[PDB]
Amino acid sequence: MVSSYFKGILLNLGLDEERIEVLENKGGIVEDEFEGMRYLRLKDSARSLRRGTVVFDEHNIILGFPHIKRVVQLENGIRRAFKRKPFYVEEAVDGYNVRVAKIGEKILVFTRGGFVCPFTTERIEDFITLDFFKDYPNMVLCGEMAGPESPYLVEGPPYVKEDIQFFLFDIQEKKTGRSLPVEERLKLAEEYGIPSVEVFGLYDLSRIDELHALIDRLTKEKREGIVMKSPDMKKIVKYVTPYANINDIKIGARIFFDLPHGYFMQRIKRLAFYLAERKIRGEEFDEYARALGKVLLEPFVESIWDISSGDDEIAELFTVRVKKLETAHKMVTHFERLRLKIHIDDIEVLDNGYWRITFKRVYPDATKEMRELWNGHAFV
Amino acid sequence: MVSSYFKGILLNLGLDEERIEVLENKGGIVEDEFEGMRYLRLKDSARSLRRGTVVFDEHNIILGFPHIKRVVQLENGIRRAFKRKPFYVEEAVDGYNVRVAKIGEKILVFTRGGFVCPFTTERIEDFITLDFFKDYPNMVLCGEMAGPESPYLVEGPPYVKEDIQFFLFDIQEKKTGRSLPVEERLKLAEEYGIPSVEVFGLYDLSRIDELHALIDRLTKEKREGIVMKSPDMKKIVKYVTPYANINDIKIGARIFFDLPHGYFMQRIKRLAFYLAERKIRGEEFDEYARALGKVLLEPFVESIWDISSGDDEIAELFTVRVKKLETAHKMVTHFERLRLKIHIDDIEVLDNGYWRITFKRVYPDATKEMRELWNGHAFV
Ligand SMILES: Nc1ncnc2c1ncn2[C@@H]1O[C@H](COP(=O)(O)OP(=O)(O)OP(=O)(O)O)[C@@H](O)[C@H]1O
Ligand SMILES: Nc1ncnc2c1ncn2[C@@H]1O[C@H](COP(=O)(O)OP(=O)(O)OP(=O)(O)O)[C@@H](O)[C@H]1O
Ligand SMILES: [Mg+2]
Ligand SMILES: [Mg+2]
Ligand SMILES: [Mg+2]
Ligand SMILES: [Mg+2]
Ligand SMILES: [Mg+2]
Ligand SMILES: [Mg+2]
Ligand code: NA
Ligand code: NA
Ligand code: NA
Ligand code: NA
Ligand code: NA
Ligand code: NA
């Protein structure tokens, strides 16, 4: 299942031979390839090697991006995580996570599971100077790809009016995964002109009222929320706006079936705790309740009416911009490998020479279940 | 774990010795006791022996009540289950399921998991003549206990103004579980004066418009829905009103945590399919969306505010009526055995000589999680 070349590497990293065999047989490690280069991807955790870690050789090991804990009560979340010490407050940008690293003579861009993304790898030169990797070849840039023309999301931050943008939020060492302190990271981003998530400033528990005001502005502006980081990057906590929880439900409700466990419940919970903590009552409360009822039912009922007539499946349309038509071919292949039913719906050339590709992604498992229910399937 | 007396019985029922040992070691069969009488309860299925089956000896075997399939699209559900043949339409009564059987010289009442219910066993003479069991000692009466003074539910049908009532919906053979045809069951209920679920009549697919009208009336009347049964009792399908789905959410949302998987999602799905099938749009649609948002958020936020100050836990209050004070003592013991934190809050004697017991049921697992979140616990 997995070559002894990679298993030798895992052994030298101190992993036990028996654990490697178990990971192999269960499919917790898998081999992959990009542009002819073989690498190992960790589908599950293995001692200190986090999920989404990729292994090309003994030196080029890109650690998986860690989970970020969230709180649902902002004031008491801050007191428990940070007490009264200062912490940085950054914008949470609603996109997809990327790790950017120099591998051999190539700059590769990895998404969360450890896949080389062919779109982001082609485009990354539009946002990040290669100079950074001439000077720091063993550092990994971590950030969010976000905007209205995204291959993986149908929403994005409102101030990105077209195409897509990179937003740096961490710099990590190859192999160890260690993060630079906030200040050194921000100094490097300025030195190299790497675009950064907005840094709102340095806060503490005593400034909770200003953070609530910040959350209300981010909400009105359709932005996702904040991420709170101790200066040494060891304590990290995220907190998202009611807009993000409501809009997430709206998007997911078109499909409803086959989503991650708890997708809707977790967001209803986050909304309830926001309303409780902010003591929201009366008409302002009713407006959230009406909005939640609408985003749960309207997209869902619309899809039901859609599938009740015809053979067409539930579908999302999205566009991306590419420099080379061959990149779009490579995204189709990559989408197939991820077991997604996506084809090219439309192509246009833009006045700046870029290709705008319109993709159509269909959802056959959600479609099947929704249709069987409409057609009267009885179930326990 | 389980006595060889009961294992001998399972062997004579054709079960394999190895399966018995597995069921024992996993806890799929467990011993229980009521008023000194030992019996075996099936916590999981075992070949033809359904979950909730109880075994006292070789003759007294009460088969677990089968799952009833539901549809979420009424018209196509009827076409798929019944085609154009006639079927009976009964009221779905919102209570708890009981099986009533003569065991030795005792009439015992079993709830769904196979527990002897001490409350319903004391009270069952108020609703069912013992004459039935003098004439049919090997038949089991199956029905719903429902009303405003229930030990297990906080809602009920509106026309039961006080106390609680039994509603027959099946008659089954001991040991085999076989159901009498609808007509013979209804003839027996009339012969013995056993109160019955309302039988709305005989319907077929061609009468779908009348069934929709029936559903709209049941909805306005705060009733649960219908159960559709072929005359030979072999095809059974339930369908519940939007009122039932909305009110269920309202009740569950006070607790939110520690509920069965999919409790809220399943009901949102049922609401969406009702609105789709009935083509509900405009203001009438907005009223359902507002109602769904309110029943999800208001009870939940209210409980959050409740637990954010004090040591009191989330709690429901309910009353029952008993003939003998000793019955209330026995319900306390029984609630403890079910791993529920319930104590007696108040007692009154009624002008008819019955005791009205007020119980308080607290929810410590839901309370703990809700409080840890309020206090800023961070989680992945
Ligand atoms: N300033 C930021 N700092 C760190 N991560 C950020 C920042 N802005 C956006 N992110 C993104 O947020 C992610 C973590 O929060 P998010 O709400 O997206 O959860 P997730 O990891 O995608 O999923 P889940 O909660 O299901 O595990 C990071 O992995 C990163 O992609
Ligand atoms: N007329 C009726 N015929 C049959 N069962 C009825 C009738 N009226 C009410 N019931 C009750 O409905 C139950 C089945 O439907 P219900 O919606 O209560 O699901 P459930 O068995 O409690 O749970 P789940 O769907 O989670 O398995 C029966 O077990 C019985 O208690
Ligand atoms: Mg995200
Ligand atoms: Mg979002
Ligand atoms: Mg269609
Ligand atoms: Mg029920
Ligand atoms: Mg109910
Ligand atoms: Mg309190
Ligand atoms: Na995460
Ligand atoms: Na888009
Ligand atoms: Na053009
Ligand atoms: Na059931
Ligand atoms: Na009650
Ligand atoms: Na009195």
Side-chain angles (χ1 to χ4, degrees), chain B residues 65 90-93 97 112 144 169 197 227 229 238:
Chain B
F65 201 70
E90 288 169 2
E91 180 174 15
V93 176
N97 179 290
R112 196 56 192 286
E144 199 82 342
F169 53 60
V197 294
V227 182
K229 321 188 145 149
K238 62 194 165 170

Side-chain angles (χ1 to χ4, degrees), chain B residues 48-57 60-67 69-82 84 86-104 106-129 131-138 140-160 162-174 176-177 179-182 185-189 191-219 221-233 236-282 284-289 291-293 295-300:
Chain B
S48 100
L49 292 185
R50 257 177 315 259
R51 179 233 185 209
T53 297
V54 300
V55 175
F56 288 78
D57 52 63
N60 289 301
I61 293 152
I62 315 304
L63 231 58
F65 201 70
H67 287 138
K69 270 160 193 206
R70 74 162 74 252
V71 292
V72 304
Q73 217 276 10
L74 180 58
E75 177 164 36
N76 292 325
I78 284 161
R79 175 195 336 270
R80 178 162 252 260
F82 299 111
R84 299 188 176 276
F87 51 88
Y88 289 85
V89 178
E90 288 169 2
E91 180 174 15
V93 176
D94 200 348
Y96 58 96
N97 179 290
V98 295
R99 291 160 290 153
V100 187
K102 165 156 187 305
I103 311 278
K106 278 197 239 214
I107 306 303
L108 300 188
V109 178
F110 307 88
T111 57
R112 196 56 192 286
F115 289 102
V116 182
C117 173
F119 162 86
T120 320
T121 299
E122 187 219 74
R123 297 289 324 272
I124 196 53
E125 80 202 323
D126 293 346
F127 315 110
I128 299 175
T129 168
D131 292 3
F132 171 84
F133 294 106
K134 312 192 201 165
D135 294 337
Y136 296 96
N138 300 322
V140 179
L141 302 177
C142 308
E144 199 82 342
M145 289 304 306
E149 303 196 77
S150 167
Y152 299 123
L153 281 84
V154 307
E155 60 168 341
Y159 46 86
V160 185
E162 61 194 7
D163 188 23
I164 199 166
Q165 273 173 218
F166 172 86
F167 299 85
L168 183 80
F169 53 60
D170 201 2
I171 303 186
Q172 295 183 3
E173 258 156 36
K174 274 196 193 150
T176 72
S179 298
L180 290 194
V182 178
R185 184 233 303 163
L186 295 181
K187 275 189 254 172
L188 283 178
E191 195 180 330
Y192 292 90
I194 301 143
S196 164
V197 294
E198 172 162 12
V199 175
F200 295 110
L202 201 65
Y203 288 80
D204 59 22
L205 180 60
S206 90
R207 296 184 67 199
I208 181 60
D209 285 337
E210 295 174 71
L211 286 167
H212 282 320
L214 174 57
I215 292 298
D216 295 341
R217 166 161 83 81
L218 297 184
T219 294
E221 290 170 6
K222 314 181 94 136
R223 288 162 83 181
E224 203 190 11
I226 63 173
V227 182
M228 287 162 283
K229 321 188 145 149
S230 59
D232 68 352
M233 272 312 271
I236 302 179
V237 173
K238 62 194 165 170
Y239 177 82
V240 308
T241 62
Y243 164 84
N245 296 314
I246 284 154
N247 206 59
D248 278 354
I249 289 164
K250 191 192 99 227
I251 292 161
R254 288 191 64 251
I255 295 145
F256 196 78
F257 301 99
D258 221 46
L259 296 185
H261 174 225
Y263 186 87
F264 299 97
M265 281 303 94
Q266 293 279 16
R267 275 147 184 92
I268 292 166
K269 174 176 97 193
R270 292 168 209 162
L271 184 59
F273 271 92
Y274 163 84
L275 300 167
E277 173 175 16
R278 303 301 296 286
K279 309 206 226 73
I280 281 163
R281 50 209 192 262
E284 172 156 58
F285 188 101
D286 296 341
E287 287 167 344
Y288 277 98
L292 173 63
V295 294
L296 283 161
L297 291 175
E298 294 196 358
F300 192 174

Side-chain angles (χ1 to χ4, degrees), chain A residues 36-43 46 48-57 60-67 69-82 84 86-104 106-129 131-138 140-160 162-174 176-177 179-182 185-189 191-219 221-233 236-282 284-289 291-293:
Chain A
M37 331 158 65
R38 221 88 190 288
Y39 64 102
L40 192 80
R41 167 163 39 90
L42 265 85
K43 288 221 209 254
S48 100
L49 292 185
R50 257 177 315 259
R51 179 233 185 209
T53 297
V54 300
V55 175
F56 288 78
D57 52 63
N60 289 301
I61 293 152
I62 315 304
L63 231 58
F65 201 70
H67 287 138
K69 270 160 193 206
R70 74 162 74 252
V71 292
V72 304
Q73 217 276 10
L74 180 58
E75 177 164 36
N76 292 325
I78 284 161
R79 175 195 336 270
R80 178 162 252 260
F82 299 111
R84 299 188 176 276
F87 51 88
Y88 289 85
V89 178
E90 288 169 2
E91 180 174 15
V93 176
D94 200 348
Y96 58 96
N97 179 290
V98 295
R99 291 160 290 153
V100 187
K102 165 156 187 305
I103 311 278
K106 278 197 239 214
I107 306 303
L108 300 188
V109 178
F110 307 88
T111 57
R112 196 56 192 286
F115 289 102
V116 182
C117 173
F119 162 86
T120 320
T121 299
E122 187 219 74
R123 297 289 324 272
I124 196 53
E125 80 202 323
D126 293 346
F127 315 110
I128 299 175
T129 168
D131 292 3
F132 171 84
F133 294 106
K134 312 192 201 165
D135 294 337
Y136 296 96
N138 300 322
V140 179
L141 302 177
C142 308
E144 199 82 342
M145 289 304 306
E149 303 196 77
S150 167
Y152 299 123
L153 281 84
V154 307
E155 60 168 341
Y159 46 86
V160 185
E162 61 194 7
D163 188 23
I164 199 166
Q165 273 173 218
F166 172 86
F167 299 85
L168 183 80
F169 53 60
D170 201 2
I171 303 186
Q172 295 183 3
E173 258 156 36
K174 274 196 193 150
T176 72
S179 298
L180 290 194
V182 178
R185 184 233 303 163
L186 295 181
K187 275 189 254 172
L188 283 178
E191 195 180 330
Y192 292 90
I194 301 143
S196 164
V197 294
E198 172 162 12
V199 175
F200 295 110
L202 201 65
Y203 288 80
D204 59 22
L205 180 60
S206 90
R207 296 184 67 199
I208 181 60
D209 285 337
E210 295 174 71
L211 286 167
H212 282 320
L214 174 57
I215 292 298
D216 295 341
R217 166 161 83 81
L218 297 184
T219 294
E221 290 170 6
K222 314 181 94 136
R223 288 162 83 181
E224 203 190 11
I226 63 173
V227 182
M228 287 162 283
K229 321 188 145 149
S230 59
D232 68 352
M233 272 312 271
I236 302 179
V237 173
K238 62 194 165 170
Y239 177 82
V240 308
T241 62
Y243 164 84
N245 296 314
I246 284 154
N247 206 59
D248 278 354
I249 289 164
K250 191 192 99 227
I251 292 161
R254 288 191 64 251
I255 295 145
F256 196 78
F257 301 99
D258 221 46
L259 296 185
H261 174 225
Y263 186 87
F264 299 97
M265 281 303 94
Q266 293 279 16
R267 275 147 184 92
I268 292 166
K269 174 176 97 193
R270 292 168 209 162
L271 184 59
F273 271 92
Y274 163 84
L275 300 167
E277 173 175 16
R278 303 301 296 286
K279 309 206 226 73
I280 281 163
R281 50 209 192 262
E284 172 156 58
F285 188 101
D286 296 341
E287 287 167 344
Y288 277 98
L292 173 63

Side-chain angles (χ1 to χ4, degrees), chain A residues 70 76 276 305 374 377 379, chain B residues 70 76 80 276 305 374 379:
Chain A
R70 74 162 74 252
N76 292 325
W305 285 331
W374 177 259
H377 276 42
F379 60 97
Chain B
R70 74 162 74 252
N76 292 325
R80 178 162 252 260
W305 285 331
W374 177 259
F379 60 97

